């Protein structure tokens, strides 16, 4: 129990069951059905609009199904956000994840969504990063952010908001 | 305890911001309580009620169906999209998108719906068509939340928004079925707990939509009343305050509490 947190999000692993996820997240924070189908959505602090959250997807509806999908917003902070528009412009589709981080800053990104369509195999893995200027994840003037998305660790596209 | 106007002035003082509100009788449309009701405030996610009014008007006209499935891709996603991100692979119906935009402030959902009504320009044209000559949407999510001081883009006035809500929900602008559906999405609002709902007595009706923006922008549009009946429209906006989300939540709740305590009168 306690609120859903970045710590709990990191604790939860690909391969875990629904019961394991609820056990770690705290069932009082989480919901299934409705808008989320057979995924489990776990809520951070009830701030009103745009509250922090995680969503966990599973291989099937079976009780023994495994986490194949982890998404979050506003639970994890970038370690050293330094994205700029010039850096963003230097990123090109086809780049590896490694090449992207070297370009935008090694601590500029967090993982928005990560899905394994052949879990436990990594074949076809999709990954969305959110990356940030210095105040992008905060308050503060440098509020730019970006969404970079990969399939098999290779960049398929990018989009930005408010970058300078 | 204090009278609504006095509570509002206290909130404005404590926030070091500006507050704008109106309380309007639903049936008659008469103004009951007003403060800065003709001044402009960023709509933030409160615009999504107008957005889905436009969607329903197309449904009434046969140009749209709530059961229509829309598919979309990574490039369509903007920040804060709990529901639309979950349904990336499967798509969502128009009705599911409105439910997500209104009840969860899902930003990408609003952008998908915005495209169906001809974007901000198209939504603003709808506003003008229904006789709102003040409210304007200019940008898409998430830039519409920017709330630059003095910038008229993406703003309404408490008075205009209250009138427009009344038009959408009780006039012939929408079919009866579309009226009930728009109301229902607001009844089912999931993220409005900290505001009026936090001080709403058991047994009262409430249907609402909230918004949060930059520079302290915060807002609620609501229909509420005792005995499980919608009686009045209450619109409360905040802007240009450095206060925390929680303080902003508390202040709106306090204004709500005053209106509720002093309801009769």
Curated annotation (Swiss-Prot), chain A:
Interacts with E.coli beta-lactamase TEM-1; interaction inhibits hydrolysis of beta-lactam antibiotics. Interacts with K.pneumoniae beta-lactamase SHV-1. Interacts with K.pneumoniae beta-lactamases KPC-2 and KPC-3; interaction inhibits hydrolysis of beta-lactam antibiotics. Interacts with E.coli beta-lactamases CTX-M-14 and CTX-M-15; interaction inhibits hydrolysis of beta-lactam antibiotics. This is Beta-lactamase inhibitory protein. Sequence repeats lie at residues 1-76, 80-164. The chain holds residues 37 to 201 of 201 of the full protein. Keywords: Disulfide bond, Repeat, Secreted, Signal. GO terms for cellular component: extracellular region. The keyword Manganese does not apply. It comes from Streptomyces clavuligerus. Changing residue 141 to A: Decreases binding affinity for K.pneumoniae beta-lactamase SHV-1 and E.coli beta-lactamase TEM-1. The keyword Glycoprotein does not apply. GO terms for biological process: regulation of beta-lactamase activity. It is found in: Secreted. Transmembrane segments: none annotated.
Curated annotation (Swiss-Prot), chain B:
Changing residue 249 to V/Q/E/C/T/H: Reduces resistance to penicillins about 8-fold and to cephalothin about 8-fold in DH10B E.coli strain. Decreases resistance to combined ampicillin and clavulanic acid about 2-fold in DH10B E.coli strain. Changing residue 209 to R: Resistance to penicillins almost unaffected in DH10B E.coli strain; reduces resistance to cephalothin about 16-fold in DH10B E.coli strain. Increases resistance to combined ampicillin and clavulanic acid 4-fold in DH10B E.coli strain. The keyword Signal applies. It comes from the Bacteria. It holds the Pfam family Beta-lactamase2. Changing residue 45 to C: Forms sulfenamide bond with Lys-48. The keyword Signal applies. A beta-lactam binds at residues 48, 105, 141. Changing residue 249 to D: Reduces resistance to penicillins about 2-fold and to cephalothin about 8-fold, in DH10B E.coli strain. Increases resistance to combined ampicillin and clavulanic acid 4-fold in DH10B strain. Inhibited by the beta-lactamase-blocking agents clavulanic acid, sulbactam, avibactam or tazobactam, or SA1-204 or LN1-255 via a covalent binding to Ser-45. Inhibitors SA1-204 and LN1-255 may be approximately 16-fold more effective than tazobactam. May also be inhibited by tazobactam via a covalent binding to Ser-105. The active site is at residues 45, 143. Changing residue 80 to G/K/N/V: Reduces resistance to ampicillin about 30-fold in DH10B E.coli strain. Disulfide bonds join 52-98. Changing residue 80 to H/Q: Reduces resistance to ampicillin about 60-fold in DH10B E.coli strain. It catalyses: a beta-lactam + H2O = a substituted beta-amino acid. Its EC number is 3.5.2.6. Changing residue 209 to C/D/E/F/G/H/I/L/M/N/P/Q/S/T/V/W/Y: Almost abolishes resistance to penicillins or cephalothin in DH10B E.coli strain. Changing residue 249 to A/L/I: Reduces resistance to penicillins about 60-fold and to cephalothin about 120-fold in DH10B E.coli strain. Decreases resistance to combined ampicillin and clavulanic acid about 8-fold in DH10B E.coli strain. NCBIfam families: bla_class_A, SHV, SHV_LEN_OKP. Broad-spectrum beta-lactamase which confers resistance to penicillins, as well as first- and third-generation cephalosporins. Has nitrocefin-hydrolyzing activity. Inactive against the cephalosporins, cefotaxime and cefoxitin, and the carbapenem, meropenem. This is Beta-lactamase SHV-1. It comes from Klebsiella pneumoniae.
């Amino acid at each position: 129990a306690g609120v859903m947190t970045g710590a709990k999000f990191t604790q939860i692993q690909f391969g875990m069951t629904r019961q394991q996820v609820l056990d770690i997240a705290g069932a009082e924070n989480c919901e299934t059905g409705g808008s989320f189908g057979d995924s489990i959505h776990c809520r951070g602090h009830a701030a009103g609009d745009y509250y922090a959250y995680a969503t966990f997807g599973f291989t099937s509806a079976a009780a023994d199904a495994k986490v194949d999908s982890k998404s979050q917003e506003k639970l994890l902070a970038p370690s050293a956000p330094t994205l700029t528009l010039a850096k963003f412009n230097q990123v090109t589709v086809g780049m590896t994840r490694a090449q992207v981080l070297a370009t935008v800053g090694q601590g500029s990104c967090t993982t928005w969504s990560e899905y394994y369509p052949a879990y436990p195999s990594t074949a076809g893995v999709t990954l969305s990063l959110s990356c940030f200027d210095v105040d992008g994840y905060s308050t503060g003037f440098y509020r730019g952010s970006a969404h970079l998305w990969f399939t098999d660790g290779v960049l398929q596209g990018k989009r930005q908001w408010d970058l300078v | 305890s204090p009278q609504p106007l006095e509570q509002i002035k206290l909130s404005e003082s404590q926030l070091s911001g500006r507050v704008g509100m109106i309380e309007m009788d639903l049936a008659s449309g008469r103004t009951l309580t007003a403060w800065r009701a003709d001044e402009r405030f960023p709509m933030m996610s409160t615009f999504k009620v107008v957005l889905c009014g436009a969607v329903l008007a197309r449904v009434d006209a046969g140009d749209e169906q709530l059961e229509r499935k829309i598919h979309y891709r990574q490039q369509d996603l903007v920040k804060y999209s709990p529901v639309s991100e979950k349904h990336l692979a499967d798509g969502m119906t128009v009705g599911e998108l409105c439910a997500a935009a209104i009840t969860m402030s899902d930003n990408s959902a609003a952008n998908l719906l915005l495209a169906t009504v001809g974007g901000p320009a198209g939504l603003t044209a709808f506003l003008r068509q229904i006789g709102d000559n003040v409210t304007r949407l200019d940008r898409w999510e998430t830039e519409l939340n920017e709330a630059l001081p003095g910038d008229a883009r993406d703003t309404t006035t408490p008075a205009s928004m209250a009138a427009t809500l009344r038009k959408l929900l009780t006039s012939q602008r929408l079919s009866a079925r579309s009226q009930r559906q728009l109301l229902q999405w607001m009844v089912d609002d999931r993220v409005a707990g900290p505001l009026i709902r936090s001080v709403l007595p058991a047994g009262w009706f409430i249907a609402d939509k909230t918004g949060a923006g930059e520079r302290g922008a915060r807002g609620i549009v609501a229909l509420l009343g005792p005995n499980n009946k919608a009686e009045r429209i209450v619109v409360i906006y905040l802007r240009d305050t450095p206060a925390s989300m929680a303080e902003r939540n508390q202040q709106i709740a306090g204004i709500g509490a005053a209106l509720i305590e002093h309801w009769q009168r």
